[PDB]
């Protein structure tokens, strides 16, 4: 079935990726992902740009003139990663835009 634009689970396991040779912690985190239909009308929480408002309108009126807008992360949050840096030192650093906080149509 074709769900509407929603935030869905996405588990990232750094150990499974072999990245524990440089990442110390965390070795896994919840990243989420966005997925689903962007249909007219965009609900307010999909927080469209003016462009997405117009494109969604045009795709509704003529799906051949433009494709629909796309369900993508509209707010993301960082996670703090403890890792071994290029100088072989322990570094704690915020990695921005790692966790989807909200999805929307763009």
């Amino acid at each position: 079935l074709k769900a509407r634009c929603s935030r869905k689970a996405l588990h990232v396991n750094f150990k499974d990726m072999g990245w524990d040779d440089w990442i110390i912690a965390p070795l896994e985190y919840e990243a989420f992902h966005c997925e689903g239909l962007c249909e007219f009308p965009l609900r307010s929480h999909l927080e469209p740009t003016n462009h997405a408002v117009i494109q969604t309108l045009m795709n509704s009126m003529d799906p051949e003139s433009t494709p629909p807008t796309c369900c993508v992360p509209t707010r993301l949050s960082p996670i703090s990663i403890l890792f071994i840096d290029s100088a072989n030192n322990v570094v704690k650093k915020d990695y921005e835009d790692m966790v989807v906080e909200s999805c929307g149509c763009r």
Binding site: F40, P41, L42, R43, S44, V53, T56, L57
Partner: protein, 75 residues
């Protein structure tokens, strides 16, 4: 004030359960669209220049034409 988002929320709430593959999609959709049209008309003056409003008005009108929803009818 422009209250288009109230109209949209109502329309989305009312049609959120609709699944195009289920047997009564168009009749519930049209009633919903008619109410959405009425709601958007009631905030029209306050919303002039608001792209979300103008897009809603046109999108609704187009859908009601596409789906052959009568202008008047149950809501």
């Amino acid at each position: 004030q422009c209250r288009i988002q109230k109209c949209t929320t109502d329309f989305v709430s009312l049609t959120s359960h609709l699944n195009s593959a289920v047997d009564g999609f168009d009749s519930e959709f049209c009633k919903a669209l008619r109410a959405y049209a009425g709601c958007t008309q009631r905030t029209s003056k306050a919303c002039r220049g608001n792209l979300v409003y103008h897009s809603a008005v046109l999108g609704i009108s187009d859908l009601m034409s596409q789906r052959n929803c009568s202008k008047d009818g149950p809501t």
